[PDB]
Structures are given as C-alpha cells and as structure tokens.
C-alpha cells in the first residue's frame, strides 16, 4: 500500500493567531493537495479555540481634552477551523513514489515505532488535528530501516478506502487497528502491520 501524505487546511474565525500551527502542506505537492492519481480522504473538520494575551492600547481622558494612552496585555479567545485529509491511491497509476510511514504521537501519547514523543531518525513530523504528529520520510535507503507498512487512516465520519466503493471504518488484510486520537469525541485510528 502506498501512502500519499496528509495535509490540513485552516481558516481563522476570531483573531489570526492559530493557522500558523494548524495548517500543514503536503510534502509531495507543496500544497494542500494530493499527488496526481491520489484522492483526498476527508478525516475531520473541527474548530480549535484557545485563550491568549493580546497587546492593546486604550485612551483614558480627563474632560475629553487631557488624554493618556496605556497599553496592556488583555485576555482574548482565538478560534480557527482545521480540515484534515490524507491521500490515498485511487488506482495503481504511476509508481513507486510515495511516503514512508514512521508512526504517530501526540503531546500526551507516545509513538510505538520509536517509543518516544518523536519520529525515527531522518523523519519529519507533520501536524494533523490539534496535536497529532505524523512521522514521514522521503528517502527509502535510509528510511526503510525505520519504516512500517502503512494500511490507512479512518475516523468516526470516514471509512478506510484501502479495505478490500464502500468505505469501511476498518483495517485491510493483515493489518492491525490502533487508536490515533479522540478529537472532540470523534475517534481517529490508523492501520499498521500486525505486530507490537
Ligand atoms: Cl465531528
């Protein structure tokens, strides 16, 4: 099975502080898209809210004619929508280009491939959802050492098209199902080869 990457779009809803950390381009395309011959699979769309301190200035006046400005940190709420995708081969189309898969982890979970909140050596962490990191690499000769076969993603709203169109929330063939994250009550899982 070939892995065409993941990506994540973002739209600011109040403030403009969040999409910097929420948006994630696809390594393979330079954009929020899938390589030719791959299909975007929409895993999830949700809004992230966050409290932050914004610097603001305000004028206090005595009799509207003697005025002074003061600037302070003020507590505000930032909100933004993220829309999460992964890329799956619709057909065999042109090969062998695709990404090596090196596990996933969050700020509060651990990556079974490396047993650390990290990716294997030479791998890039890509942002997905609010805090998931997806470990990815492009160099087969150094990556395959640290790569596990990848069997797809699926979520509470979207099945896994690699199962063998019907989109079943399942893992294909000889792959085992593992929980990635629960994002605002929505389950997101991934599939890897049977193993510890
Ligand atoms: Cl949802």
Please state, in angstroms and rounded to a whole number, the distance separating the CA atoms of residues 100 and 35.
15
CA of 23 to the centre of ligand 1 (A): 18
The domain total for the chain is 1
Structure-token pair, residue 163: 């199962």
Residue ranges in the chain assigned as alpha helix (H): 19-22, 140-143
Give burial (CB, 10 Å; 0-12/13-18/19+) of 28.
buried
CA of 186 to the centre of ligand 1 (A): 6
CA of 155 to the centre of ligand 1 (A): 9
> Which residues does residue 127 pair with via DSSP β-bridges, in sequence order?
133
Cβ-contact 142, 135 below 8 angstroms: no
Give burial (CB, 10 Å; 0-12/13-18/19+) of 113.
buried
Structure-token pair, residue 108: 């509060």
Structure-token pair, residue 136: 């990815």
CA of 37 to the centre of ligand 1 (A): 28
182 is in which domain, residue-wise? Answer: 1-196
CA of 6 to the centre of ligand 1 (A): 18
CA of 153 to the centre of ligand 1 (A): 16
CA 196 and chain centroid, separation? 24
Resolution in A: 2.0
Please state, in angstroms and rounded to a whole number, the distance separating the CA atoms of residues 31 and 28.
8
Residue numbers followed by a gap, the chain, C–N over 2.5 Å: 164
CA of 46 to the centre of ligand 1 (A): 6
CA of 131 to the centre of ligand 1 (A): 16
Give burial (CB, 10 Å; 0-12/13-18/19+) of 59.
exposed
Cβ-contact 191, 169 below 8 angstroms: no
């Amino acid at each position: 099975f070939t892995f065409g990457g993941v990506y994540q779009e973002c739209t600011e809803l109040s403030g403009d502080v969040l999409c910097q950390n929420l948006e994630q381009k696809n390594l393979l395309t330079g954009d929020f898209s899938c390589p030719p011959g791959y299909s975007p699979v929409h895993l999830l769309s949700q809004t992230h809210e966050e409290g932050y301190s914004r610097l603001e200035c305000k004028k206090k006046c005595t009799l509207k004619i003697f005025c002074k400005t003061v600037c302070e940190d003020v507590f505000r709420v930032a909100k933004a929508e993220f829309r999460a995708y992964w890329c799956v081969a619709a057909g065999q189309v042109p090969d062998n280009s695709g990404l090596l898969f090196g596990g996933v982890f969050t700020d509060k979970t651990i990556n079974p491939m490396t047993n650390a909140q990290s990716c294997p050596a030479g791998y890039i962490p890509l942002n997905l959802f609010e805090s998931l990191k997806v470990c990815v690499s492009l160099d087969y000769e150094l990556g395959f050492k640290f790569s596990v076969p990848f069997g797809g993603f699926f979520s509470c709203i979207m099945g896994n098209p690699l199962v063998n169109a019907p989109s079943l929330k399942k893992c294909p063939g000889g792959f085992s199902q593992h929980l990635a994250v629960i994002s605002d009550g929505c389950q997101v899982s991934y599939c890897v080869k049977a193993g510890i």
